[PDB]
Design a protein around this ligand. Structure first.
Ligand SMILES: [Cl-]
Ligand SMILES: [Cl-]
Ligand SMILES: [Mg+2]
Ligand SMILES: [Mg+2]
Ligand SMILES: [Mg+2]
Ligand SMILES: [Mg+2]
Ligand SMILES: [Mg+2]
Ligand SMILES: [Mg+2]
Ligand SMILES: [Mg+2]
Ligand SMILES: [Mg+2]
Ligand code: NA
Ligand code: NA
Ligand code: NA
Ligand code: NA
Ligand code: NA
Ligand code: NA
Ligand code: NA
Ligand SMILES: [Sr+2]
Ligand SMILES: [Sr+2]
Ligand SMILES: [Sr+2]
Ligand SMILES: [Sr+2]
Ligand SMILES: [Sr+2]
Ligand SMILES: [Sr+2]
Ligand SMILES: [Sr+2]
Ligand SMILES: [Sr+2]
Lengths: 154, 95, 186, 140, 160
RNA sequence: CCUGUCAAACUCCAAACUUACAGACGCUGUUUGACGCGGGGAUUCCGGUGCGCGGGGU
RNA sequence: AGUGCAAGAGCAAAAGAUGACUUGACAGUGUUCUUCCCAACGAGGAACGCUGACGCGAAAGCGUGGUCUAGCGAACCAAUU
RNA sequence: UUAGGCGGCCACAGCGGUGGGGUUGCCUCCCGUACCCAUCCCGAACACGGAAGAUAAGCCCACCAGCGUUCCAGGGAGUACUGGAGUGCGCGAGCCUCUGGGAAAUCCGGUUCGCCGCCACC
């Protein structure tokens, strides 16, 4: 399971790339989705490689992000341990987070919005013109590397 | 194109590779297809009779009946539905 | 053979056994082929339909399995030809085959020949094959009159082994009668 | 082994290449059978502008008709070494050509399942000289 | 005409003589120089002139560089010295010129050029150890009459 | 035999890629009716630029 | 090689060659593709049928002109069946 | 299939070459033209009739890789080329990095001297 974050806008972006991001329920900049690791899903993130930031999150980080940025399928309601317990198949946030990582279920399947609408990176990102291997913030990240971005986008 | 004829720009598609030269094997020329069957349209360069317009080479149509010995195959050209009269010699089964 | 551009003919064409141009025309009918072959000492007659991995033979008759019914004469002639054709057509009727088309292969369509006699046999067995009556031999040459009248120009016998002297085309009549019988183990 | 390997005469082809007939009579009388007309291909400037037109005649002789011709034809010519084919045939003279081969040439000349004769069963120039020399004449 | 009109490889490959007529002959005299009877393997030293950029060199430049290279080898080693130089590239690409304004713009044939890729050997001379600094100078004069910057690479020279 | 080079109108080879149909996931539609069909009204048929690939031309 | 003519393509017990016979280069009416990719538009063209009558062949079968892609013309008026 | 008939794929099956195999069996060559039929001339072929002889051809069987071919290994090569991205470099031509794909030639070594279907048959 990888976490996708659109870091580049829609203007001048190819339509077939734009539509892939819309298929991955990600419509704005700084938005985040939890995409599984299939052949079909990998073909999609590879096509989005230059306009996104992906990698596998740590259980600790996924939890932090879900607590602060997860929303129900409809409404303002804060997703806390009590919300999870009353609406999901799990006990707390950790139980849901473990399931998302082990690819047992999806946010949509549990009545949550497939999008974790994040805040801009505190202290800023490493740049949207170069990949991670060149010192930027585009493409595939380390598990420790994606956390730094996901946590900065609390 | 310098001309709008049927065989315009068809040097490649309507020519055989040297080893596939000469008369084609009869087994495929007398193949029996049933209605609803998905078939692959590809002209055999060795067979003169029963062809279609080269623009449809590569289509995968659906057999919807026959007209004499030739088959009436339903395809979709872009967005327009078309019915192609073609013999078995230029058809292969799907899957 | 020479290089990459060289075109090696289809196997049964290198072997000079199949006329692929005539085969395509034969298969166009949809009807099963009555394969009529002839060897020096023998005559073969098969009923072949088209299959997925090659041809299928549903009924056949070789002139060697003719002696199983009472033949004591040679097997590569006109009376033998008809009978091998009748025996093929009869087994065909038992297989559920009703109509056919004559495949003479690489043989010549010479009037009154053995391959046309094989066809006359199958027609008389109950099979519906598109023919032409005046391209077949007159009933006596099918019976074996030409051979008996060659033994009339005797001095020395025509046959080596002891079948008979003046030859009997009556054996043909007796054998056609044996096969026309409703009983018989086919 | 030897019986199905010993050479025989296939055909004795006698021909006269003129270029414009009256000479059909002399072939029929010397051979024993009927002659056939010979046409030509391509337009030539030596007043031979017509394609399908009689140039000469030929007669293909087989079996007894072949031997009964050669008993009177061979003494009319002094046979040489360089006058032989790689396949074991020879032409002399009025042209008289003799085709020689081993007892299984039907395999190459038939319709059903024909095959060309292997180089190990084909006749040699030496095996050709030896056969005709063993039939009333000399070599060299 | 300047080489600026023909040095780049931006045009399609135009070589098919069966469709191109009126092509001027090559100004190049010979590609094989020196002792063309002796082998290339008979020499301990092999030095090649390598082109650094991907360019199109005209027949006139190929000749002008070959001439001023071989003339130095003839001056220093004699007309029958123990060397052999080869010009391995041939002028295959046909050149046009539009010489009426831009209407019917496809030009008439004016010459021939050689498409040389970067890193390719234009010249290759085979010599003996003592004559090595003469051939390195023949190439220094030759690279001055073509379009790209060049390398003088010694392929069989452990003698230094 | 050896040795030196080429191809828009060459090919013993041969991609990336584009493309037909189908399945799967995704997304989407069944009160926001998609896909589609029928009808009313247009405007429009001087375009331009970047990037990629081009063809012509110094 | 040859296959009437550009060019590209097809063809070897043939689509080439020879020989013989024959007039389907037939009448009627269509389905379909093309002309006009997609996507509307005539004439023209082609593929593929059927009806009627025929030719050849032992027969399956082949013949809706020439192996395939150029060789074409509305209304009105006239002549013609 | 102790030698057969009709095929499918249509060179992995082609070209070339070596060894073996046939008494009433098979396939051939073979023997022979009264007939059916046959050659613009020839029973050569085609067609018909038949076994005196043979395994030399063919064919069937086993095998050889020199040539052509199929596929694979390792090297060439993750090179050539390339879909996506870049306020990376270069006067420029062009190059480079990241991401997703990925040849061809040639060399060396293996493979390949057909596979499969129906039928009939000591
Ligand atoms: Cl069509
Ligand atoms: Cl036969
Ligand atoms: Mg909401
Ligand atoms: Mg700040
Ligand atoms: Mg920045
Ligand atoms: Mg092309
Ligand atoms: Mg008017
Ligand atoms: Mg008139
Ligand atoms: Mg043997
Ligand atoms: Mg710059
Ligand atoms: Na073919
Ligand atoms: Na002007
Ligand atoms: Na679906
Ligand atoms: Na416009
Ligand atoms: Na029309
Ligand atoms: Na004549
Ligand atoms: Na044998
Ligand atoms: Sr340009
Ligand atoms: Sr002007
Ligand atoms: Sr320079
Ligand atoms: Sr394209
Ligand atoms: Sr035609
Ligand atoms: Sr004979
Ligand atoms: Sr400059
Ligand atoms: Sr790979």
């Amino acid at each position: 399971m990888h976490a996708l974050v659109q870091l580049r806008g829609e203007v001048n972006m190819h339509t077939d790339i734009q539509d892939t991001l819309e298929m991955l329920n990600i419509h704005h900049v700084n938005h985040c989705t939890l995409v599984p690791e299939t052949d079909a899903y990998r073909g999609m993130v590879a096509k989005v490689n230059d306009f996104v930031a992906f990698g596998e999150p740590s259980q600790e980080t996924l939890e932090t992000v879900l607590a602060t940025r997860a929303e129900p399928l409809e409404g303002d309601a804060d997703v806390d341990d009590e919300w999870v317990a009353e609406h999901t198949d799990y006990d707390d946030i950790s139980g849901l987070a473990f399931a998302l990582l082990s690819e047992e279920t999806t946010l949509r399947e549990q009545g949550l919005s497939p999008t974790l609408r994040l805040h801009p990176p505190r202290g800023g990102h490493d740049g949207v013109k170069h990949p991670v291997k060149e010192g930027g913030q585009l493409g595939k990240h380390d598990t420790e590397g994606i956390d730094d971005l996901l946590e900065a986008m609390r | 194109p310098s001309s709008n004829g049927p065989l315009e720009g068809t040097r490649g598609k309507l020519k055989n590779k040297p080893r596939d030269r000469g008369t084609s094997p009869p087994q495929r020329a007398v193949e029996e297809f049933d209605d609803g069957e998905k078939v692959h349209l590809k002209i055999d360069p060795s067979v003169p009779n029963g062809r279609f317009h080269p623009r449809f080479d590569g289509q995968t149509g659906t057999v919807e009946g026959k007209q004499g010995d030739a088959y009436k195959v339903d395809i979709v050209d872009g967005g327009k539905e078309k019915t192609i009269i073609v013999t078995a010699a230029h058809l292969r089964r799907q899957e | 053979a020479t290089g990459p551009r060289y075109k090696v003919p289809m196997r049964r064409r290198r072997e000079a056994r199949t006329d692929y141009h005539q085969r395509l025309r034969l298969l166009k009918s949809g009807k099963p082929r009555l394969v009529a072959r002839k060897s020096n000492k023998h005559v073969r007659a098969q009923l072949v339909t088209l299959g997925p991995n090659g041809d299928d033979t549903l009924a056949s008759a070789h002139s060697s399995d003719l002696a199983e019914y009472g033949w004591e004469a040679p097997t590569g002639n006109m009376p033998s030809a008809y009978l091998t054709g009748l025996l093929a057509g009869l087994r065909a009727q038992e297989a559920g085959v009703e109509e056919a088309v004559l495949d003479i292969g690489l043989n010549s369509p010479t009037p009154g020949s053995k391959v046309f006699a094989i066809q006359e046999g199958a027609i008389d067995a109950g099979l519906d094959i598109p023919h032409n009556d005046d391209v077949l031999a007159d009933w006596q040459r099918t019976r074996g009159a030409h051979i008996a009248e060659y033994d009339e120009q005797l001095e020395e016998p025509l046959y080596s082994g002891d079948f008979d002297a003046a030859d009997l085309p009556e054996h043909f009549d007796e054998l056609r009668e044996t096969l026309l019988d409703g009983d018989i183990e086919l | 082994f030897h019986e199905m390997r010993e050479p025989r005469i296939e055909k004795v082809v006698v021909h006269m290449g003129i270029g414009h007939a009256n000479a059909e009579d002399i072939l029929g009388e010397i051979t024993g059978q009927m002659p056939v007309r010979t046409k030509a291909k391509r337009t030539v400037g030596e007043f031979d502008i017509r394609e399908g037109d009689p140039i000469g005649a030929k007669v293909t002789l087989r079996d007894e008709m072949a031997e009964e011709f050669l008993q009177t034809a061979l003494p009319l010519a002094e046979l040489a070494t360089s006058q032989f084919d790689d396949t074991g045939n020879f032409s002399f003279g009025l042209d008289v050509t003799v085709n020689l081969v081993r007892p299984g040439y039907r395999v190459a000349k038939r319709d059903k399942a024909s095959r060309s004769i292997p180089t190990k069963h084909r006749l040699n120039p030496a095996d050709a000289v030896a056969f005709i020399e063993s039939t009333y004449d000399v070599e060299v | 005409k300047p080489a600026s009109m023909y040095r780049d490889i931006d045009k399609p490959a135009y070589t098919r003589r069966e469709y191109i007529t009126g092509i001027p002959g090559s100004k190049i005299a010979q590609h094989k120089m020196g002792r063309k009877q002796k082998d290339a393997d008979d020499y301990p030293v092999q030095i090649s002139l390598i082109v650094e950029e991907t360019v199109q060199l005209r027949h006139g430049s190929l000749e002008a560089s070959r001439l001023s290279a071989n003339r130095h080898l003839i001056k220093e080693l004699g007309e029958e010295g123990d060397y052999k130089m080869t010009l391995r590239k041939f002028p295959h690409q046909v050149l046009r010129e539009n010489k009426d304004g831009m209407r019917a713009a496809f030009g008439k044939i004016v010459g021939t050029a050689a498409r040389v890729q970067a890193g390719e050997q234009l010249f290759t001379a085979y010599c003996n150890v003592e004559d090595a600094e003469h051939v390195k100078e023949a190439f220094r004069r030759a690279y001055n009459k073509i379009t790209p910057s060049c390398r003088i690479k010694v392929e069989r020279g452990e003698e230094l």
